[PDB]
């Protein structure tokens, strides 16, 4: 891969999928600097599958996104996959790459770790 992030193989894929599905329901999350550079590539590849729209793209995106009930729609229990391919894919129909922006906050208390904020542009 790219960087191990201090975990094992099976634990790393369960954590990267947890952050990607969180950046779709909230569009802005706080995390660590090293983990923000890795989820930056996981989400930007899922938006590319949403701009295609084929049935082969909806199934290639069901391997990453978890099953959560976004209430962003505010009605009918919309899934984390139904928000994708919809309002998210329409916002970046003309943008070619670079759908992520990370901002730096500072070292946190008790850990000395770089807190950051990653959000959809």
């Amino acid at each position: 891969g790219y960087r191990k992030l201090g975990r094992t193989s099976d634990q790393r894929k369960a954590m990267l999928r947890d952050l990607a599905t969180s950046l779709i329901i909230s569009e802005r999350i706080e995390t660590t600097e090293a983990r923000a550079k890795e989820v930056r590539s996981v989400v930007e590849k899922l938006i590319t599958l949403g701009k295609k729209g084929d049935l082969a793209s909806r199934r290639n995106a069901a391997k990453t996104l978890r099953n959560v009930e976004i209430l962003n729609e505010d009605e009918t229990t919309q899934t984390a996959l139904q928000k994708l391919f919809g309002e998210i894919a329409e916002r970046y129909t003309e943008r070619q790459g670079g759908y992520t922006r990370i901002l730096k906050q500072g070292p946190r208390r008790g850990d000395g770790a770089e807190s950051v904020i990653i959000e959809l542009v």
């Binding site: 901002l103 730096k104 906050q105 500072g106």
Partner: protein, 50 residues
């Protein structure tokens, strides 16, 4: 392995010569007026606006 001899005040104070820390490297933000770190947001009222 144990120390064969005691340690002096001279030898103890020479080793801690480089046991120091440096200035955080801060600058001034011309939106909040207060000091802040580089490539980061003003922790007081304001934002990055790079």
């Amino acid at each position: 392995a144990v120390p064969k001899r005691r340690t002096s005040k001279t030898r103890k104070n020479k080793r801690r010569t480089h046991f120091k820390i440096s200035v955080p490297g801060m600058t001034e933000c011309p939106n909040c007026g207060e000091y802040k770190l580089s490539h980061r947001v003003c922790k007081n009222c304001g934002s990055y606006n790079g």
